[PDB]
Amino acid sequence: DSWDKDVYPEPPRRTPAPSPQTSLPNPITYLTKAFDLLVDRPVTLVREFIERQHAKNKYYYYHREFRRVPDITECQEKDVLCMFEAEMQWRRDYKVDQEIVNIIQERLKACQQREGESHRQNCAKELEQFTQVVKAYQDRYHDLGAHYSARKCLAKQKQRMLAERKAAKEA
Amino acid sequence: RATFQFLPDEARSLPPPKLTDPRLAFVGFLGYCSGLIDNAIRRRPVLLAGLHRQLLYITSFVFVGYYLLKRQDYMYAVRDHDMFSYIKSHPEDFPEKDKKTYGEVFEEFHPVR
Ligand SMILES: CCCCCCCCCCCCCCCCCC(=O)OC[C@H](COP(=O)(O)OCCN)OC(=O)CCCCCCCCCCCCCCCCC
Ligand SMILES: CCCCCCCCCCCCCCCCCC(=O)OC[C@H](COP(=O)(O)OCCN)OC(=O)CCCCCCCCCCCCCCCCC
Ligand SMILES: N=C(N)NC(=N)NCCc1ccc(I)c(Cl)c1
């Protein structure tokens, strides 16, 4: 349609059919018909005119593809030329991961509004997915500081890997 | 290398400073400023007075500056020639290291909590 329903899923809509139990006319029914006549139709035609001009001038833009380069683990110590590329790549991935957490947060918030008073039970998958991704993001990037770098990230991972190894040794 | 010589012969194997050298342009500018100050202290029209005098200020500065820049370049070439030849003469004092990657070198992590 406009976005991808996989990335931003919406459960199928279920609308109850009107069941008027009163003889009185419904004010919402006629205001809706007025809104379509007075607002929707003129606004729709104005848009179709604009969509005609765009179809006469069709041009394209692209999503940049970033080749993968060796990460900071493969860089010799103080080799700026290799460090620079690994460092820039790590920075790009840091921004992308930030937007991944935003997507999962957006799903979580959309579910909370959609489900209403039942959100507590009907948004368990969204909450679980959000909890896991925030754990992964925290492990990668939390506590690096303002002057974060791929090096500080790697040093934080190695420290974490060491702790996991020692506990495993206790087992 | 030659005793009490401003520009030894070996300095001729180096390329001379270009006449459009940015450093030389600055020196010429200093000569222009000196010419202006000369008019001002003597209470003459600063920009207009004595264009022959102002020309000679620019020319003398550029002339001297060209040779100073040439000796400057020569002395830095000599410094590197000496430094690299010494490294070659004493390999055991400048040994090539084995370069570890960051995946092997252990660096301690300091959290910013
Ligand atoms: C591409 C050029 C860029 C310019 C860079 C300037 C850098 C500073 C250069 C210092 C040398 C300036 C020339 C020496 C001063 C002589 C000027 C003077 O004494 O009075 C101004 C004079 C006009 O007054 P008058 O005495 O009546 O002479 C009539 C001529 N029209 O003559 C004039 O009409 C004006 C002459 C210039 C006035 C200079 C004013 C003083 C500037 C010093 C401030 C520090 C400079 C900025 C610091 C950063 C350097 C980039
Ligand atoms: C380190 C990097 C930066 C480089 C720095 C370079 C600095 C060194 C360069 C030399 C600096 C001094 C240059 C002064 C230039 C102004 C000379 C001038 O215009 O003189 C005008 C006139 C006298 O000129 P005149 O003697 O007739 O020329 C023949 C010289 N044999 O009559 C006059 O009205 C002159 C009066 C104003 C001058 C002040 C008094 C000094 C007298 C100098 C006499 C002329 C010297 C000729 C300079 C030639 C230098 C190559
Ligand atoms: N520190 C001292 N007493 N002497 C001294 N300047 N040693 C430094 C050696 C040196 C530096 C620049 C150049 I150009 C050159 Cl040819 C030689």
From Swiss-Prot, chain A:
The chain residues annotated with the modification Phosphoserine are S149
Q: Where is the composition biased (Basic and acidic residues)?
A: 1-13
Q: InterPro entries of this UniProt entry?
A: NADH_UbQ_OxRdtase_su10 (IPR019377), NDUFB10 (IPR039993)
Where does the chain cross the membrane? none
Q: Where is the signal peptide?
A: none
Residues covered by region (Disordered):
1-25
Example GO CC term: the record gives: mitochondrion
Q: Where does this protein reside within or beyond the cell?
A: Mitochondrion inner membrane
Chief localisation class: mitochondrion
In the record, the note on similarity to other proteins reads: Belongs to the complex I NDUFB10 subunit family.
The free-text function statement in the UniProt record for this protein reads:
Accessory subunit that is involved in the functional assembly of the mitochondrial respiratory chain complex I. Complex I has an NADH dehydrogenase activity with ubiquinone as an immediate electron acceptor and mediates the transfer of electrons from NADH to the respiratory chain.
Q: By what name is this protein known?
A: NADH dehydrogenase [ubiquinone] 1 beta subcomplex subunit 10
Q: Which organism is it from?
A: Bos taurus
Q: Report the gene name.
A: NDUFB10
From Swiss-Prot, chain B:
From the Swiss-Prot or TrEMBL record, state where the protein is found: Mitochondrion inner membrane
Does the entry feature the keyword rRNA processing, yes or no?
no
Q: Which InterPro entries match?
A: NDUC2 (IPR009423)
UniProt topology in membrane: Single-pass membrane protein
Q: Which Pfam families match?
A: NDUF_C2 (PF06374)
Q: Which UniProt keywords apply?
A: Acetylation, Electron transport, Membrane, Mitochondrion, Mitochondrion inner membrane, Respiratory chain, Transmembrane, Transmembrane helix, Transport
- Transmembrane regions listed in the UniProt entry: 50-69
Record's GO cellular component terms? mitochondrial inner membrane; mitochondrion; respiratory chain complex I
Output the GO biological process annotations, alphabetical, semicolon-separated.
Answer: mitochondrial electron transport, NADH to ubiquinone; mitochondrial respiratory chain complex I assembly
Claim: Transmembrane helix is one of the keywords in the record: yes
Chief location of this protein? mitochondrion
- Kindly provide the PTM information from the record: There is a minor unacetylated form of subunit B14.5b.
Family in the record: Belongs to the complex I NDUFC2 subunit family.
According to the record's subunit comment, the protein's assembly and interactions are: Complex I is composed of 45 different subunits. Interacts with TMEM242.
Described by its record, this protein's role is as follows:
Accessory subunit of the mitochondrial membrane respiratory chain NADH dehydrogenase (Complex I), that is believed not to be involved in catalysis but required for the complex assembly. Complex I functions in the transfer of electrons from NADH to the respiratory chain. The immediate electron acceptor for the enzyme is believed to be ubiquinone.
The name under which this protein is listed is NADH dehydrogenase [ubiquinone] 1 subunit C2
